[PDB]
Design an enzyme around this catalytic site. Structure first.
Site, PDB file in Angstrom:
ATOM      1  N   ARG A  58     -73.053-108.797 -49.523  1.00 31.18           N
ATOM      2  CA  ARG A  58     -73.259-108.376 -50.913  1.00 31.18           C
ATOM      3  C   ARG A  58     -74.770-108.590 -51.294  1.00 31.18           C
ATOM      4  O   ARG A  58     -75.515-107.705 -51.818  1.00 31.18           O
ATOM      5  CB  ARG A  58     -72.240-109.017 -51.825  1.00 31.18           C
ATOM      6  CG  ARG A  58     -70.856-108.244 -51.617  1.00 31.18           C
ATOM      7  CD  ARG A  58     -69.804-108.623 -52.610  1.00 31.18           C
ATOM      8  NE  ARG A  58     -69.870-110.085 -52.725  1.00 31.18           N
ATOM      9  CZ  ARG A  58     -68.986-110.873 -52.132  1.00 31.18           C
ATOM     10  NH1 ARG A  58     -68.027-110.341 -51.363  1.00 31.18           N
ATOM     11  NH2 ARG A  58     -68.982-112.198 -52.270  1.00 31.18           N
ATOM     12  N   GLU A  67     -71.183-100.684 -74.087  1.00 34.86           N
ATOM     13  CA  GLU A  67     -70.774 -99.509 -73.320  1.00 34.86           C
ATOM     14  C   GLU A  67     -69.359 -99.097 -73.733  1.00 34.86           C
ATOM     15  O   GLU A  67     -68.374 -99.731 -73.270  1.00 34.86           O
ATOM     16  CB  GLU A  67     -70.736-100.077 -71.886  1.00 34.86           C
ATOM     17  CG  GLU A  67     -70.239 -98.815 -71.077  1.00 34.86           C
ATOM     18  CD  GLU A  67     -70.315 -99.036 -69.524  1.00 34.86           C
ATOM     19  OE1 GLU A  67     -70.956 -99.983 -69.040  1.00 34.86           O
ATOM     20  OE2 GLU A  67     -69.858 -98.024 -68.763  1.00 34.86           O
ATOM     21  N   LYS A  93     -74.631 -97.632 -74.053  1.00 31.82           N
ATOM     22  CA  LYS A  93     -74.403 -97.036 -72.743  1.00 31.82           C
ATOM     23  C   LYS A  93     -73.132 -96.232 -72.826  1.00 31.82           C
ATOM     24  O   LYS A  93     -72.026 -96.813 -72.560  1.00 31.82           O
ATOM     25  CB  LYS A  93     -74.321 -98.117 -71.651  1.00 31.82           C
ATOM     26  CG  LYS A  93     -73.897 -97.569 -70.251  1.00 31.82           C
ATOM     27  CD  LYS A  93     -74.170 -98.591 -69.054  1.00 31.82           C
ATOM     28  CE  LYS A  93     -73.773 -97.882 -67.698  1.00 31.82           C
ATOM     29  NZ  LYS A  93     -74.155 -98.854 -66.589  1.00 31.82           N
TER      30      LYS A  93
END
EC number: 4.1.2.13
Lengths: 357, 357, 357, 357
Positions: free
Chosen positions: B65, B197, B239
């Site tokens: 990752r 968002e 967003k």
């Protein structure tokens, strides 16, 4: 016109909690509010326990908390007057003297076990300094399913409203209403009857008129929100403060003044389909709490739901004192517990007699 | 009449977040939305990472990752086009090749580090099957203060709205608005600029008209709630999705159709004081995402805030492919990252050229 | 699940005014807010006219009202600076010197004729003493269609908010927002561009900070309501007060302070799709009104809509004085009118010069 | 902090109608809902009268309207079963046979005179085709004071909600709630007890489940609004539809099904402090209306307010027929009126017997 087929649950009037525990919820609630019975609130946090023990010098351990609870819970006979106990999370998992968990022991003995599921007060941030929201919605369904599975059949969540300067911000009124209504819904979904506690606190110098003005507003907004989230009224309970003068106002009301202001306030906002109100005693003396409840049950105003108690200190205070944290105070501790529980059981029937206290 | 002295914060018009990070918030936001720059969203959960790696056969470990993030974050030069990176919690604490934490490395390099602070989607319970709320408000201030202290200066929280049957329940509209507005406030309180968002998802057969009708409604309610909770508009960002036909609708829009529907929708609801909109690319191809943003920045409608990108797959897809999970794909992986980041940087200036992709 | 076919207009996101005058509305509005132009408000009631005439000793008859209006309306040349006139109902039907009705004359001359359609202020009854609602929704469509048919193409409705004790009741905030949003919708339905006037009054000792706090709240609620009723933002206008200190506060602000507080307030709440704001001048001197508008049009904050004037006394005061109610004062009366109209026309371009007043 | 002294009526919890008719309102209402009594609605408009007369060939004049009213109002003896009559404006001023005005005659005879004060249904414009708002708030206080002065002591205002496609727009739900709550407040201010009539119409093919879903939602919003406007619950009444299947649904419910759905719906939303519900009979037969009311008064669910009738056609239909528009039908017309009024009086006591009809 342009028509479209949609799910009915996408329509406004159809946002209603559909829960397969429905009938069970309704039955628990009627059990909780049986005539001559009320709830023992025993959901003090570990810290609150420090306080509780302070005057008797009892050290604050898990074992001692267990004993402090057993003092009441294993007080055989208390079952006649108490229909359910609001436990703290720790108590759910502790064992009764028989070796059953507490929830198991109480159910066997006829007492519905509930659990305090909120995560405590925190600063509201919006509104005015001193106001507080309550945490605990995250991970809620998983906790609640776990309590159900442990045998709890009801839960409790407390929000508070601090009167300052005669009023409260509209921010706290709305936000805390919104939190209580969400909690209610999710509780019912997982099988636990929700006790909705919107406590207008007794703290401050305000008087009883101020108390009534703020409670009426706080509580109607709690109702509007419960409708807006879709609650099953018949499977829900309310745990409000009584309407009384503020703790530092300098004035004391009679019980009949109290019951009228309280009941007339509630009758303006609470739908008659909600099965019962289990008043909190916050700040009142053990006697006052019984006298005030008794008057409610003697009030000529409309009061279609059961009016009973959901008390902690006002049922434990003296007991705790007499018990002393010692095995040896055990019997006296119980005697006192029983007597207060009996007082209150009569006060729910509207037959309490002060000469008897 | 009876007058009383109260705190101004007990009055309705005074429920405004007062935050000593105010000016810092405002400055971060302008930094985030600098001309020719946008945000790299790299806040995939561990699971989302499985998905991401799936096609390259890369195993799903913390180390990998780290590498997948370093691929982009240590792509020297990307700083010209990316003004901030939305990290995942795990990445905040990982180390860059210099041995600084990632936040430390990015800040040094001129990139504002942000953090995804929501706790993920969960069933709304109210409204219709398929709708989802987002968790994460509990313990929020303590997390957020901790990210700030680690160097993050902005955060991101995503709520979604699934169109089904042409519509969405009013329950999800309201509840998710309420959650976004709360999150915003608390973020600002702790020093992090909140990216709000409210994603109307591209999922379904709906068309672009349906998309516009639902987005306009969802987004005005998000605004009303931000006002109602007291947000600092100048220290906040949005967003949103673009307004486009649904993924399974069968239709594809031109970019100029997209930019007009999007910008005319936003201009109806978003206050001009909010500094910038960082569009999400959810479901669009890497090319479309650039073409669509470019058209926005060429649209004659009113658009007073900066219009830029906040993209994940649409900036990483090809890169990930070229990288292959191997050191050896590293250079090609970057080349591709840079190119997409450059495309988008031009699209924010409204100068992207498709001949160039 | 159980699905049902319904009209889309039965869904929340579809409550949008659909009006076949749409494009016409949009075009009127752009006409109204053309660069270097503003609106003359000449919609004084018969009573207000008494006041107006008082100092010149002009008797209060229909004929004299006609003349007082003709003074301005037949001031050839004023058309360069005034794009529309808000008439009073009586004036709509009076005749210009050519024998056309006033609306007919103005249209011919290039000036859009509008009409004040509210029915006046009345006690709010709810909230606090001194607050006021506005009447006039009953029979509204029939009146409005009749004005349209007479040639009016825009209308005006004023609600007020009296600051007392630093605040305003939430009751007036909400109720008056609700009234303005209803009026807007119905106006658009009948073909008239609505000027939404939510005047936070200058009356009182409050300061400019109090003014900004109340206006921001009043105006966001007006916006939320317009969204909730479905308004066509692109076919609507706003007529707000400027944010200034209260008339009896003892303080006077500079124009640059004014423009910043005003524009930063508006930029927090008004969608950029609303084409223009036509400020009211209520209580300001004729000079201040021009200086303050000019600064707006020189303010660096975001201000995507046109910022212009919609003034009555501040365009007529001196004229009225010079005219004197006599034919003989006619020319001087006009000269003065023209000069103030020119001042303001420049102030809309942000080029006014005080040395010139 | 910064504190300020404000009026308590500027605070949210203090928006409560303060009316010096308070106690009178409360007393009228108890009078209206006395046991074994109900209201005769006789407030048909002139047009509705055409309809009414149509089948008997009675011409539609003021004189004949007078006679049609006198038929019932001067039916000596009806006073035992009817506690109040909702008059039409025209009737208020007509004279009874004694030469007293009707209001004067009824009061003397022990019947409280009320007045229909709304101005009729009009297109809602917002929401869906077919939905309707009600006009009449403009000039309301002056009318209402005038009726009071004529002796009326209660008033009635009807809003309707048309179920189509299983639902109703949220626009009509909210707007009509808002109108009813405003009307209530102002009525109380002027001394008239308001009958709040939010009729979910029987029109359509919907079934009883749909009826209950929409009524419950419509009515809780009416309640939330009454709280929000400050109504005196104890001085107010409700006139709702019963919950039944739609008129064209093809299904007929038993009375016991009806009373349970109705009463369980109401018990979920109406505060117990509202003194009484006077059901409308709209679309039901004269018999059904009595059977359905009777079952209500036999229902085991909670029903703390009086449950009685406020009927027009269902009390007049047969009478009108037997009367025939002729002096000569007068006696039979009354006999029939009396019998229906007696049926309903028993049904309020829960003792009606169908064998008796």
């Amino acid at each position: 016109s342009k028509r479209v087929e949609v799910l009915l649950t996408q329509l406004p009037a159809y946002n209603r909690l559909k829960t397969p525990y429905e009938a069970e919820l309704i039955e628990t609630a009627k059990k909780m509010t049986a005539p001559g019975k009320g709830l023992l609130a025993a959901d003090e946090s570990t810290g609150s326990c420090s306080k509780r023990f302070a005057g008797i010098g009892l050290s604050n351990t898990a074992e001692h908390r267990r004993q402090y609870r057993a003092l009441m819970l294993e007080c055989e006979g208390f079952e006649q007057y108490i229909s359910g106990v609001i436990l703290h999370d720790e108590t759910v998992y502790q064992k009764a003297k028989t070796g059953e968990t507490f929830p198991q022991y109480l159910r066997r003995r006829g007492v519905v076990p509930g659990i305090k599921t909120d995560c405590g007060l925190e600063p509201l941030v919006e509104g005015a300094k001193g106001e507080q929201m309550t945490a605990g919605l995250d991970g809620y369904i998983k906790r609640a399913k776990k309590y159900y599975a442990m045998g709890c059949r009801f839960c409790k969540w407390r929000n508070v409203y601090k009167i300052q300067n005669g009023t409260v911000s509209e921010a706290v009124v709305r936000f805390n209403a919104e939190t209580l209504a969400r909690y209610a819904i999710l509780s019912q979904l997982c099988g636990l009857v929700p006790i909705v506690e919107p406590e207008v606190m007794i703290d401050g110098t305000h008087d009883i008129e101020t108390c009534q003005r703020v409670s009426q507003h706080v509580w109607s907004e709690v109702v509007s929100a419960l409708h807006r989230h879709g609650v099953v009224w018949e499977g829900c309970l309310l745990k409000p403060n009584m309407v009384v003068p503020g703790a530092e106002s300098g004035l004391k009301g009679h019980a009949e003044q109290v019951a009228e202001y309280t009941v007339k306030t509630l009758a303006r906002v609470i739908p008659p389909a909600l099965p019962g109100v289990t008043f909190l005693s916050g700040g009142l003396s053990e006697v006052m709490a019984s006298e005030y409840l008794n008057a409610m049950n003697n009030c000529p105003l409309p009061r279609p739901w059961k009016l009973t108690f959901s008390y902690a200190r006002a049922l434990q205070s003296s007991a705790i004192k007499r018990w002393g944290g010692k095995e040896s105070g055990v019997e006296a501790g119980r005697r006192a517990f029983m007597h207060r529980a009996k007082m209150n059981s009569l006060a729910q029937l509207g037959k309490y007699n002060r000469a008897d206290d």
